[PDB]
Protein backbone atom coordinates (compact mmCIF):
# COMPACT_ATOMS: atom_id res chain seq x y z
CA UNK A 1 0.00 0.00 0.00
CA UNK A 2 1.34 3.40 -1.08
CA UNK A 3 -0.27 6.45 0.54
CA UNK A 4 0.18 9.98 -0.79
CA UNK A 5 0.95 12.10 2.29
CA UNK A 6 -1.52 14.83 3.23
CA UNK A 7 -0.20 18.40 3.17
CA UNK A 8 -0.99 20.47 6.27
CA UNK A 9 0.25 23.93 7.23
CA UNK A 10 1.79 24.21 10.70
CA UNK A 11 2.79 27.33 12.64
CA UNK A 12 5.32 27.40 15.47
CA UNK A 13 3.66 28.60 18.66
CA UNK A 14 4.95 31.74 20.36
CA UNK A 15 3.24 31.22 23.74
CA UNK A 16 2.41 27.93 25.45
CA UNK A 17 0.41 27.11 28.57
CA UNK A 18 -3.23 26.64 29.44
CA UNK A 19 -4.22 30.25 28.82
CA UNK A 20 -2.65 30.19 25.35
CA UNK A 21 -4.03 26.78 24.37
CA UNK A 22 -7.60 27.75 25.25
CA UNK A 23 -7.29 30.90 23.14
CA UNK A 24 -5.81 28.89 20.26
CA UNK A 25 -8.77 26.51 20.27
CA UNK A 26 -11.17 29.47 20.28
CA UNK A 27 -9.66 30.43 16.89
CA UNK A 28 -10.20 27.03 15.27
CA UNK A 29 -6.73 25.66 15.98
CA UNK A 30 -5.22 22.65 17.75
CA UNK A 31 -1.90 22.56 19.62
CA UNK A 32 0.48 19.84 18.48
CA UNK A 33 3.90 18.36 19.28
CA UNK A 34 6.43 17.01 16.78
CA UNK A 35 8.93 14.69 18.45
CA UNK A 36 10.68 11.56 17.25
CA UNK A 37 14.26 10.86 16.29
CA UNK A 38 14.72 14.60 15.80
CA UNK A 39 15.01 14.57 19.60
CA UNK A 40 13.92 18.19 20.03
CA UNK A 41 10.15 18.71 20.22
CA UNK A 42 8.47 21.44 18.18
CA UNK A 43 5.32 23.15 19.45
CA UNK A 44 2.99 23.64 16.49
CA UNK A 45 -0.54 24.76 15.71
CA UNK A 46 -2.84 23.18 13.13
CA UNK A 47 -6.12 24.16 11.52
CA UNK A 48 -9.00 22.51 13.35
CA UNK A 49 -11.28 22.01 10.34
CA UNK A 50 -8.45 20.89 8.04
CA UNK A 51 -7.05 18.42 10.58
CA UNK A 52 -10.47 16.86 11.16
CA UNK A 53 -10.97 16.43 7.41
CA UNK A 54 -7.76 14.40 7.12
CA UNK A 55 -8.71 12.13 10.03
CA UNK A 56 -12.25 11.62 8.73
CA UNK A 57 -11.27 10.02 5.42
CA UNK A 58 -7.76 8.58 5.87
CA UNK A 59 -8.17 7.15 9.38
CA UNK A 60 -6.62 7.93 12.73
CA UNK A 61 -3.10 6.76 11.80
CA UNK A 62 -2.82 9.22 8.94
CA UNK A 63 0.57 10.08 7.48
CA UNK A 64 1.07 13.84 7.19
CA UNK A 65 3.36 16.39 5.56
CA UNK A 66 3.77 19.53 7.65
CA UNK A 67 4.90 22.87 6.22
CA UNK A 68 6.66 24.27 9.30
CA UNK A 69 7.30 27.82 8.07
CA UNK A 70 8.81 26.67 4.78
CA UNK A 71 10.36 23.34 5.85
CA UNK A 72 8.78 20.07 4.72
CA UNK A 73 8.46 17.27 7.27
CA UNK A 74 7.01 13.76 7.18
CA UNK A 75 4.97 13.09 10.31
CA UNK A 76 2.64 10.39 11.59
CA UNK A 77 -0.31 10.81 13.93
CA UNK A 78 0.58 9.12 17.23
CA UNK A 79 -2.19 10.08 19.68
CA UNK A 80 -5.19 12.35 20.09
CA UNK A 81 -6.86 14.14 23.01
CA UNK A 82 -10.65 14.10 22.56
CA UNK A 83 -13.11 15.71 24.96
CA UNK A 84 -15.62 13.16 26.33
CA UNK A 85 -18.62 15.50 26.02
CA UNK A 86 -17.96 18.16 23.38
CA UNK A 87 -16.07 15.57 21.26
CA UNK A 88 -13.21 17.85 20.20
CA UNK A 89 -9.54 17.38 19.36
CA UNK A 90 -7.75 19.08 22.25
CA UNK A 91 -4.22 18.02 21.25
CA UNK A 92 -2.26 15.85 18.83
CA UNK A 93 1.03 14.01 19.27
CA UNK A 94 3.00 13.80 16.02
CA UNK A 95 5.93 11.43 15.44
CA UNK A 96 8.57 12.13 12.80
CA UNK A 97 9.17 9.30 10.33
CA UNK A 98 11.18 8.64 7.18
CA UNK A 99 10.52 6.39 4.21
CA UNK A 100 11.71 2.83 4.73
CA UNK A 101 11.11 2.83 8.50
CA UNK A 102 9.04 0.32 10.46
CA UNK A 103 6.53 1.60 13.03
CA UNK A 104 4.17 -0.14 15.47
CA UNK A 105 0.56 0.85 14.82
CA UNK A 106 -2.90 -0.26 15.96
CA UNK A 107 -5.37 -0.58 13.09
CA UNK A 108 -9.07 -1.36 13.30
CA UNK A 109 -10.65 -4.68 12.30
CA UNK A 110 -14.06 -4.83 10.64
CA UNK A 111 -16.57 -7.69 10.56
CA UNK A 112 -18.34 -8.15 7.22
CA UNK A 113 -20.72 -10.89 6.17
CA UNK A 114 -23.87 -12.59 7.45
CA UNK A 115 -23.45 -15.81 9.42
CA UNK A 116 -25.90 -18.60 10.25
CA UNK A 117 -29.29 -17.04 11.13
CA UNK A 118 -29.32 -18.60 14.60
CA UNK A 119 -26.12 -16.90 15.76
CA UNK A 120 -25.04 -13.60 17.31
CA UNK A 121 -21.66 -12.10 16.40
CA UNK A 122 -19.77 -10.46 19.27
CA UNK A 123 -16.48 -8.65 18.64
CA UNK A 124 -14.14 -8.69 21.64
CA UNK A 125 -10.98 -6.89 20.48
CA UNK A 126 -11.61 -3.66 18.59
CA UNK A 127 -8.07 -3.21 17.23
CA UNK A 128 -4.88 -5.23 16.79
CA UNK A 129 -1.22 -4.23 16.61
CA UNK A 130 0.90 -4.49 13.47
CA UNK A 131 4.38 -3.45 12.33
CA UNK A 132 4.43 -1.95 8.83
CA UNK A 133 6.40 0.58 6.84
CA UNK A 134 5.95 4.29 7.52
CA UNK A 135 4.01 4.98 4.31
CA UNK A 136 2.46 1.49 3.99
CA UNK A 137 0.10 1.33 6.98
CA UNK A 138 -3.25 -0.26 6.02
CA UNK A 139 -6.20 2.03 6.61
CA UNK A 140 -8.31 -0.83 7.98
CA UNK A 141 -8.39 -4.61 8.24
CA UNK A 142 -11.37 -6.83 7.47
CA UNK A 143 -12.58 -10.29 8.45
CA UNK A 144 -15.37 -12.37 6.94
CA UNK A 145 -18.15 -14.20 8.79
CA UNK A 146 -20.05 -15.97 6.01
CA UNK A 147 -21.58 -19.31 6.95
CA UNK A 148 -19.66 -19.49 10.23
CA UNK A 149 -21.42 -22.04 12.42
CA UNK A 150 -22.14 -21.95 16.16
CA UNK A 151 -19.30 -21.37 18.61
CA UNK A 152 -16.08 -20.39 16.85
CA UNK A 153 -13.24 -18.13 17.97
CA UNK A 154 -11.80 -16.01 15.16
CA UNK A 155 -8.33 -15.22 16.47
CA UNK A 156 -5.89 -12.41 15.72
CA UNK A 157 -3.52 -14.90 14.11
CA UNK A 158 -6.00 -15.68 11.32
CA UNK A 159 -6.41 -12.09 10.10
CA UNK A 160 -5.28 -11.79 6.49
CA UNK A 161 -2.51 -9.18 6.40
CA UNK A 162 -1.01 -7.51 3.31
CA UNK A 163 2.62 -7.94 2.35
CA UNK A 164 5.18 -6.09 4.44
CA UNK A 165 2.88 -6.14 7.49
CA UNK A 166 3.78 -8.24 10.53
CA UNK A 167 1.55 -9.03 13.49
CA UNK A 168 2.94 -7.72 16.79
CA UNK A 169 0.27 -8.71 19.31
CA UNK A 170 0.14 -12.37 20.28
CA UNK A 171 -1.68 -14.72 17.89
CA UNK A 172 -4.12 -15.81 20.62
CA UNK A 173 -6.29 -12.67 20.83
CA UNK A 174 -9.99 -13.51 20.61
CA UNK A 175 -10.98 -10.89 18.04
CA UNK A 176 -14.40 -12.14 16.90
CA UNK A 177 -16.61 -14.53 18.88
CA UNK A 178 -19.61 -16.14 17.16
CA UNK A 179 -22.05 -17.84 19.54
CA UNK A 180 -25.63 -19.06 19.67
CA UNK A 181 -28.15 -16.22 19.69
CA UNK A 182 -29.58 -15.77 23.20
CA UNK A 183 -33.23 -16.66 23.72
CA UNK A 184 -35.84 -14.73 25.68
CA UNK A 185 -35.22 -16.86 28.78
CA UNK A 186 -31.46 -16.26 28.47
CA UNK A 187 -32.01 -12.49 28.37
CA UNK A 188 -33.92 -12.30 31.66
CA UNK A 189 -31.15 -14.04 33.64
CA UNK A 190 -28.32 -11.76 32.45
CA UNK A 191 -27.91 -8.86 34.86
CA UNK A 192 -30.58 -9.71 37.44
Amino acid sequence: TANIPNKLTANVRTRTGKGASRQARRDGKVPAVLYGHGTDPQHLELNARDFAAVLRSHGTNAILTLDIEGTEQLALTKALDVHPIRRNIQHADLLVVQRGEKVTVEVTVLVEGDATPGTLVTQDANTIEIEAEALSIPEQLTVSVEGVEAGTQITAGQISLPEGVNLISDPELLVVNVVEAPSAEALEEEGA
Partner: protein
Protein backbone atom coordinates in the same frame (compact mmCIF):
# COMPACT_ATOMS: atom_id res chain seq x y z
CA UNK B 1 -31.90 -6.23 41.66
CA UNK B 2 -28.16 -5.65 41.89
CA UNK B 3 -26.84 -5.78 45.47
CA UNK B 4 -23.24 -6.25 46.68
CA UNK B 5 -22.59 -9.39 48.69
CA UNK B 6 -20.79 -7.44 51.42
CA UNK B 7 -19.22 -4.07 52.17
CA UNK B 8 -16.67 -3.20 54.85
CA UNK B 9 -18.47 -0.02 55.93
CA UNK B 10 -22.25 -0.01 55.90
CA UNK B 11 -22.88 3.69 56.64
CA UNK B 12 -20.98 6.10 54.40
CA UNK B 13 -20.88 9.74 53.39
CA UNK B 14 -22.67 10.82 50.24
CA UNK B 15 -20.72 10.42 46.98
CA UNK B 16 -19.46 13.70 45.56
CA UNK B 17 -21.10 14.99 42.39
CA UNK B 18 -18.40 17.23 40.90
CA UNK B 19 -16.43 16.92 37.69
CA UNK B 20 -16.78 14.71 34.64
CA UNK B 21 -16.00 11.03 34.27
CA UNK B 22 -12.36 9.97 33.96
CA UNK B 23 -12.88 6.36 32.90
CA UNK B 24 -15.68 4.42 31.30
CA UNK B 25 -16.52 7.04 28.67
CA UNK B 26 -16.21 4.75 25.63
CA UNK B 27 -18.21 1.81 24.31
CA UNK B 28 -16.13 -1.36 24.73
CA UNK B 29 -18.38 -4.44 24.71
CA UNK B 30 -21.36 -3.72 22.46
CA UNK B 31 -22.12 -1.68 19.36
CA UNK B 32 -24.46 0.94 20.88
CA UNK B 33 -24.44 2.64 24.25
CA UNK B 34 -26.09 5.21 26.50
CA UNK B 35 -23.87 8.08 27.62
CA UNK B 36 -24.87 10.22 30.59
CA UNK B 37 -25.00 14.02 30.49
CA UNK B 38 -25.79 14.89 34.12
CA UNK B 39 -24.88 14.00 37.70
CA UNK B 40 -27.19 11.63 39.56
CA UNK B 41 -27.43 8.65 41.89
CA UNK B 42 -28.78 5.79 39.76
CA UNK B 43 -30.63 3.49 42.14
CA UNK B 44 -30.59 -0.28 41.67
CA UNK B 45 -34.33 -0.17 40.92
CA UNK B 46 -33.97 2.18 37.95
CA UNK B 47 -31.35 -0.14 36.44
CA UNK B 48 -33.68 -3.14 36.64
CA UNK B 49 -36.54 -1.08 35.21
CA UNK B 50 -34.28 0.18 32.41
CA UNK B 51 -32.81 -3.17 31.31
CA UNK B 52 -36.22 -4.85 31.20
CA UNK B 53 -37.35 -2.10 28.83
CA UNK B 54 -34.50 -3.11 26.52
CA UNK B 55 -35.33 -6.81 26.88
CA UNK B 56 -38.99 -6.38 25.93
CA UNK B 57 -38.24 -4.36 22.80
CA UNK B 58 -35.62 -6.64 21.21
CA UNK B 59 -37.42 -9.86 22.27
CA UNK B 60 -35.10 -12.77 21.49
CA UNK B 61 -31.75 -11.87 19.98
CA UNK B 62 -29.00 -9.62 21.24
CA UNK B 63 -26.94 -9.04 24.37
CA UNK B 64 -27.07 -6.28 26.99
CA UNK B 65 -24.28 -4.98 29.23
CA UNK B 66 -24.62 -2.91 32.41
CA UNK B 67 -21.39 -1.02 33.12
CA UNK B 68 -22.35 0.52 36.49
CA UNK B 69 -22.96 -1.26 39.77
CA UNK B 70 -24.99 0.01 42.74
CA UNK B 71 -22.28 -0.27 45.41
CA UNK B 72 -22.64 2.78 47.65
CA UNK B 73 -25.50 2.80 50.19
CA UNK B 74 -27.70 5.67 51.30
CA UNK B 75 -29.41 5.71 54.68
CA UNK B 76 -32.89 6.73 55.82
CA UNK B 77 -33.86 7.35 59.43
CA UNK B 78 -37.18 6.12 60.86
CA UNK B 79 -40.26 8.11 59.94
CA UNK B 80 -41.75 10.87 62.11
CA UNK B 81 -38.86 11.34 64.53
CA UNK B 82 -36.94 14.40 65.65
CA UNK B 83 -33.36 15.10 64.61
CA UNK B 84 -30.54 13.39 66.47
CA UNK B 85 -29.82 10.06 68.16
CA UNK B 86 -27.63 8.34 65.61
CA UNK B 87 -27.59 7.78 61.87
CA UNK B 88 -30.24 5.98 59.86
CA UNK B 89 -30.07 2.42 58.61
CA UNK B 90 -29.22 1.86 54.92
CA UNK B 91 -32.17 1.49 52.60
CA UNK B 92 -31.16 1.86 48.93
CA UNK B 93 -28.02 1.31 46.85
CA UNK B 94 -26.99 3.92 44.29
CA UNK B 95 -24.29 4.42 41.66
CA UNK B 96 -22.51 7.76 41.32
CA UNK B 97 -22.81 8.78 37.66
CA UNK B 98 -20.93 11.74 36.17
CA UNK B 99 -21.33 13.28 32.70
CA UNK B 100 -19.59 11.30 29.99
CA UNK B 101 -20.09 7.95 31.73
CA UNK B 102 -21.45 5.15 29.54
CA UNK B 103 -24.16 3.21 31.38
CA UNK B 104 -25.66 0.53 29.12
CA UNK B 105 -24.60 -1.27 25.96
CA UNK B 106 -26.34 -3.37 23.32
CA UNK B 107 -25.58 -5.63 20.36
CA UNK B 108 -28.35 -6.13 17.82
CA UNK B 109 -28.29 -6.93 14.08
CA UNK B 110 -30.31 -3.92 12.89
CA UNK B 111 -30.05 -0.26 13.84
CA UNK B 112 -33.63 1.06 13.96
CA UNK B 113 -34.70 -1.42 16.64
CA UNK B 114 -31.45 -0.99 18.58
CA UNK B 115 -31.83 2.79 18.83
CA UNK B 116 -35.52 2.44 19.75
CA UNK B 117 -34.77 -0.10 22.50
CA UNK B 118 -32.18 2.20 24.07
CA UNK B 119 -34.59 5.14 23.90
CA UNK B 120 -37.14 3.15 25.92
CA UNK B 121 -34.53 2.99 28.70
CA UNK B 122 -33.50 6.65 28.78
CA UNK B 123 -37.07 7.43 29.83
CA UNK B 124 -36.66 5.41 33.04
CA UNK B 125 -33.48 7.21 34.26
CA UNK B 126 -33.54 10.51 36.18
CA UNK B 127 -31.08 12.24 33.82
CA UNK B 128 -30.55 13.27 30.23
CA UNK B 129 -28.55 10.90 28.05
CA UNK B 130 -27.69 10.22 24.43
CA UNK B 131 -27.08 7.19 22.24
CA UNK B 132 -23.48 6.67 21.12
CA UNK B 133 -21.83 4.11 18.86
CA UNK B 134 -18.43 2.42 18.59
CA UNK B 135 -17.35 4.54 15.61
CA UNK B 136 -15.54 7.88 15.74
Amino acid sequence: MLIPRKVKHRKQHHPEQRGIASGGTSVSFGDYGIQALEHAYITNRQIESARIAINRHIKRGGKVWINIFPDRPLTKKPAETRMGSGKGSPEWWVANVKPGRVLFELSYPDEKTARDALTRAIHKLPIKARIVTREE
